[PDB]
Amino acid sequence: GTKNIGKGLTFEDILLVPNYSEVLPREVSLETKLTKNVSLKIPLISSAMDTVTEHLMAVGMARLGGIGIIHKNMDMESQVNEVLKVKNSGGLRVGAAIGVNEIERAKLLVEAGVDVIVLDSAHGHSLNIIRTLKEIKSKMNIDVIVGNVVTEEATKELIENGADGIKVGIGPGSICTTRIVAGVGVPQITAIEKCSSVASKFGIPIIADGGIRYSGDIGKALAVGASSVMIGSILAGTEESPGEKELIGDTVYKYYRGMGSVGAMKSMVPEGIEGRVKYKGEMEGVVYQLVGGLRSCMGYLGSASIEELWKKSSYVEITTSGLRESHVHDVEIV
Amino acid sequence: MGTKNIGKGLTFEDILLVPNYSEVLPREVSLETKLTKNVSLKIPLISSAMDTVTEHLMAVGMARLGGIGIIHKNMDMESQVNEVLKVKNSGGLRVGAAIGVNEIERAKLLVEAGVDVIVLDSAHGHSLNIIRTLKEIKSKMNIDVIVGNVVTEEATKELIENGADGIKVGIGPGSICTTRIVAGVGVPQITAIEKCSSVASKFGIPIIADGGIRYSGDIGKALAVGASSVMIGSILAGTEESPGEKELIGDTVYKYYRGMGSVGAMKSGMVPEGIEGRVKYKGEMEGVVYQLVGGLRSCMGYLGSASIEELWKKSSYVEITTSGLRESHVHDVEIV
Amino acid sequence: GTKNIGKGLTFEDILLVPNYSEVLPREVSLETKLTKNVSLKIPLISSAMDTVTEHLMAVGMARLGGIGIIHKNMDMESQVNEVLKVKNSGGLRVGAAIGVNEIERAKLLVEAGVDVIVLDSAHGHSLNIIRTLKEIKSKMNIDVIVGNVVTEEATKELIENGADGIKVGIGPGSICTTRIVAGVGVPQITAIEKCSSVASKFGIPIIADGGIRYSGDIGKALAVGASSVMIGSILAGTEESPGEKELIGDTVYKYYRGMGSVGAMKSMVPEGIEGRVKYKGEMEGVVYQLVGGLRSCMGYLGSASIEELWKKSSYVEITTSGLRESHVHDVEIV
Amino acid sequence: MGTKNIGKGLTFEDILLVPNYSEVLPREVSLETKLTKNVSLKIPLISSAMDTVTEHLMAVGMARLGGIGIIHKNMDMESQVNEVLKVKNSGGLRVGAAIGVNEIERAKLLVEAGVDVIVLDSAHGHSLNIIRTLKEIKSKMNIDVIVGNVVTEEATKELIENGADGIKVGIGPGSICTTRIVAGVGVPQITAIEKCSSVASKFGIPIIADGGIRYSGDIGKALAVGASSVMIGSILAGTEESPGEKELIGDTVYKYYRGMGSVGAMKSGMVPEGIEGRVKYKGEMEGVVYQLVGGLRSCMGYLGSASIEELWKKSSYVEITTSGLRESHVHDVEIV
Numbered sequence A, C: 001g002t003k004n005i006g007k008g009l010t011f012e013d014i015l016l017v018p019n020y021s022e023v024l025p026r027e028v029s030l031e032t033k034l035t036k037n038v039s040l041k042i043p044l045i046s047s048a049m050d051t052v053t054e055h056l057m058a059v060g061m062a063r064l065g066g067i068g069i070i071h072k073n074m075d076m077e078s079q080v081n082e083v084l085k086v087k088n089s090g091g092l093r094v095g096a097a098i099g100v101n102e103i104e105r106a107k108l109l110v111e112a113g114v115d116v117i118v119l120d121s122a123h124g125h126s127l128n129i130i131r132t133l134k135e136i137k138s139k140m141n142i143d144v145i146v147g148n149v150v151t152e153e154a155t156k157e158l159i160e161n162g163a164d165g166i167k168v169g170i171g172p173g174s175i176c177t178t179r180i181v182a183g184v185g186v187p188q189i190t191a192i193e194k195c196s197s198v199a200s201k202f203g204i205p206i207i208a209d210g211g212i213r214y215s216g217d218i219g220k221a222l223a224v225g226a227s228s229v230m231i232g233s234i235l236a237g238t239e240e241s242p243g244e245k246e247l248i249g250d251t252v253y254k255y256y257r258g259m260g261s262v263g264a265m266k267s268m269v270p271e272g273i274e275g276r277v278k279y280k281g282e283m284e285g286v287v288y289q290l291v292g293g294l295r296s297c298m299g300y301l302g303s304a305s306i307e308e309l310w311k312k313s314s315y316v317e318i319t320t321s322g323l324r325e326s327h328v329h330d331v332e333i334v
Numbered sequence B, D: 001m002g003t004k005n006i007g008k009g010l011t012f013e014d015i016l017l018v019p020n021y022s023e024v025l026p027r028e029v030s031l032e033t034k035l036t037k038n039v040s041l042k043i044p045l046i047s048s049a050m051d052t053v054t055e056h057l058m059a060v061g062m063a064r065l066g067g068i069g070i071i072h073k074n075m076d077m078e079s080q081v082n083e084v085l086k087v088k089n090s091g092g093l094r095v096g097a098a099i100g101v102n103e104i105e106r107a108k109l110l111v112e113a114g115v116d117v118i119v120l121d122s123a124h125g126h127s128l129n130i131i132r133t134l135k136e137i138k139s140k141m142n143i144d145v146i147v148g149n150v151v152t153e154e155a156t157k158e159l160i161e162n163g164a165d166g167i168k169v170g171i172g173p174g175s176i177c178t179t180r181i182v183a184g185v186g187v188p189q190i191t192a193i194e195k196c197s198s199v200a201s202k203f204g205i206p207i208i209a210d211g212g213i214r215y216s217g218d219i220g221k222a223l224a225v226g227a228s229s230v231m232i233g234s235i236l237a238g239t240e241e242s243p244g245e246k247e248l249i250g251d252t253v254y255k256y257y258r259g260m261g262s263v264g265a266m267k268s269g270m271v272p273e274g275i276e277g278r279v280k281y282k283g284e285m286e287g288v289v290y291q292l293v294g295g296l297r298s299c300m301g302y303l304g305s306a307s308i309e310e311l312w313k314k315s316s317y318v319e320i321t322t323s324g325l326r327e328s329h330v331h332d333v334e335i336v
Ligand SMILES: C[C@H](Oc1cccc2ccccc12)C(=O)Nc1ccc2oc(-c3ccncc3)nc2c1
Pocket: A121, A122, A123, A126, A127, A128, A129, A178, A258, A259, A260, A261, A268, A269, A270, A271, B022, B023, B024, B025, B026, B298, B299, B301, B302
């Protein structure tokens, strides 16, 4: 078929191959770039969703060396106050999301000391987005991350128009139904590869957004060219997320919903669902495990930093049965 | 490899459409299309010619929303003419009707009743008897004829040369179809549309993608690789306007939906190649069709395509694995 | 690696592509060669298993135009009597299985009027199978089908030593655990193709043995080069099979076991299991559906005979996802 | 495509061995193999060095049947020496024992206690510390050393150059392993054996295939593609002789089986990379081993191979799909 441009791989399709190593998981540097001008101690960002990130989550993230993006599902004043709450909790970095044409919101956020603006849309590669980007860059001084995209052409054009970071991901989210409602998407490993191929030569960080299920996925995302990953579902279950708590049967769940779900849209046909995730308690322990798995990954790959990981990493493509071998098999877990 | 292996076939679940630079919003795209070389539709949806899907009410519903319904042939000629008359007496609405091989008298009566298109459908559209029936209709009356079902370039080419005004594609992909297991025969639906489109497009003859549409995203996929429209069965079978009977099983209400090649449908009036099944009741078709149209607009927005013609020009896809598909649907989260 | 000789396809991996057709399913001729000198009206053979084929099953198959192979899990006299019961019921054709070195059994079966001897082994391409074959051919005159094999070299050697039919299948059987226990096998479509590539040069019929689950599988097997197919589990649940009945809940089951199962061997680690299949009633109806399915396949393929089907057939490889589209989906059966 | 992609990795389930012309019966095949450069076994089976699989009882059982057990290191040096002595006090019986990085003193005490082989084991064999430890051992004591775990040509080559007497292959394939999930790291076991044996065989150094053996047929596969032996954990964990404790859950007796990188094994004395699980109780190890050896003989008979060396020369395999896998197992029959 003439329109077939190749096979796309997701996190589950691959495994990273071990390298000769002289570096322990504990010695690895997880320091990375959020945007061309902003640095992070760990490569973790909490999603801009109303069931994931408000001030409490963003303080937690920043204290752990990562960063939180305050969602835009609220008035400008309430969003500015969330930013101020984080800035008033010490010298802590914080970000905030805006939509297309939201120049006024952007200005007010920047006035409030926000470190990065995340200009996000279901379809980053669009005329309205590029215009908003250009308007912001000419009217205020701040780093702008733009998303969401999955192609080299999208990456190249956004960078040409002033993007300080590029957020990658259409379809891989746990609550996303874009692939089913619209039939559109690119498997996340392939999308990071394609965007990194353009972005890295201009020094522009890729944020891998969506579909992180396990700590092993973080390593994979960074290995193929991401500077950081944005995480929703894994954190929505923690104590510091704004979601409500409901007892289903005997276990407690936190609400977690796409920002393109009918409920999130009430507060276009939906491209996200309203779901539940198991409660996980303090985010600190959750994040510790995530950082733990990534250090372990970099130790296996003999990489003392993310930059080194990019030069040293390789992967094998596996089958669904190879996936069976990867997980736990034939043993009941206690 | 084996000598008889002609390559890998892809279905809807095997691919994903790649986003393009877009200057067009979903609300702005034109869904206008051609049903046949002489008949146009405002949206590219057709309801299946099945006795659990399309009679007069469903056809009226379809036409009002800009699509079309094909009245099934599991009824006497007079009953079928009358159903067509119902739709025609309800405004100036377009409507189709199905006929079987050699049913020239039925075709004539349907055309006189003001039917807009005849659908000459068979389980195996690439056959001598079908072609004979086609030639005879085209010589005895003046009307557009859609012929199916086929899955190959040679079949598409032969039908067009003999006067087909539209080509219906699909052997095996239908939800109620067991052709692939009873006969071992079929072609995955993406590959079949591509093969047939590669021939029909230069002739300007529309391809109807028939069967296996489960989600709105499949419509986008089907059109993107060369279909001008899609024909839909199971999705509409559960609606208020379909003719099937309703059964309460446990708590939920179900509607009957059966293949026209199941034992029950063949009794109405060879081993079966369809099953008799049930689908959940979904209420008014308007809300169902609104979603489908909505998802297709979203698709065309992502693809920067203001029209179906542009969609054919601009679209590309990636093939994905089973684990890729798991990432497409909902994962690790319990839906409410 | 260097030992990877390619991808192997089974029935479920492929679909036959429709051809231009001027032949109705009812007009299709199903006549075929069982062996070089024995013909059948339909290409169906009942398996040589103690839960499938004794005289009643063999009479049933022969009346419908196929053939039954009386199993060897009984003393010589008992097997001869089974053969005599079929021959006493008209001119009806019948076959009988023997094992390696079973020359006396062969002689007796032949004297009793058997039409074909099936020299059966787990591993047909072995020195002692060849020696048994050579010994049979020089001491009596009948057609001998030899199996089971899956390679070109096996087929060539057996034919050169006097085989009148070649039986293909290691691993694909419903009750077979050879692939799990020994790690050995070849997917059935690839095995038929490989063996047909040699046998057809010599006019020697291929029997496709094991793994038929639906009538569609029969068409596939014949399409890629088989002259007939041997069937076990499908017939094992019919009233004519020797198996015993057992009520489980509200469903009636017939026992069905591999001849390499623990229970059959005491009638070496086992390579088959003891199982149950659902009771399907009269065998005539079952066979009607199978024949019906094959006629439909040959109608779609414009082939008026198996010979024409070999000439005209072609197939497409499908994915697991493709297979979900083949079966029934999203609709619950009544 | 994607530039960091080194190719498709195959696990045991992805392949099937192809039968060869055979003149050798299963009962006639020789299963004698080299454990290390200087140590031979009667059968190519090793019990895993885990605290729910191998202590003295298991090690004696393995040795009697022609294989060997590796005493785990989750105990003090004295306790470990004592296990080794018990096996040695039970006839002229082979035994191995594991040590970790820098555990030179432990190694010395084990060697003077008469251990036949030292297994220098780490989650990541291809590391500077492992190599240092290896060189240190080879210079201070006379003993065969098996090093692991690795999955690459370069790792295999470097370990051999620094004095390894055997190479243990396996990162991610074990039943209780979560390395592939937690760290995202691993190589499918067939591919890993092939790559490592491509180097090791040139030097005549035995490859041990460790983890992911689920059925006897997997042993055949592992050896066929170049392993000289296989290490097994879960299969032996449910036997009488494993040191794990029993627990009744429901109406079935289970024994505990846990990774040595599970939170409970590390508490026993980093983020965990193994789980704490349960396997069904299976009685005597002798019966279990008989079946395993039985399957391997059957495999070598199908391949016309009278010895493992001949099996390396003669073996070939075909890749299968998950649908081919369906066919391999039992299907459509309810097992009694
Ligand atoms: C309703 C849907 O919502 C989302 C989809 C995906 C991710 C989401 C993340 C957060 C919140 C909402 C999300 C959507 O906006 N869909 C959609 C589809 C196609 C579009 O195409 C365009 C567009 C095309 C050309 N110019 C401007 C916009 N916007 C689009 C929006």
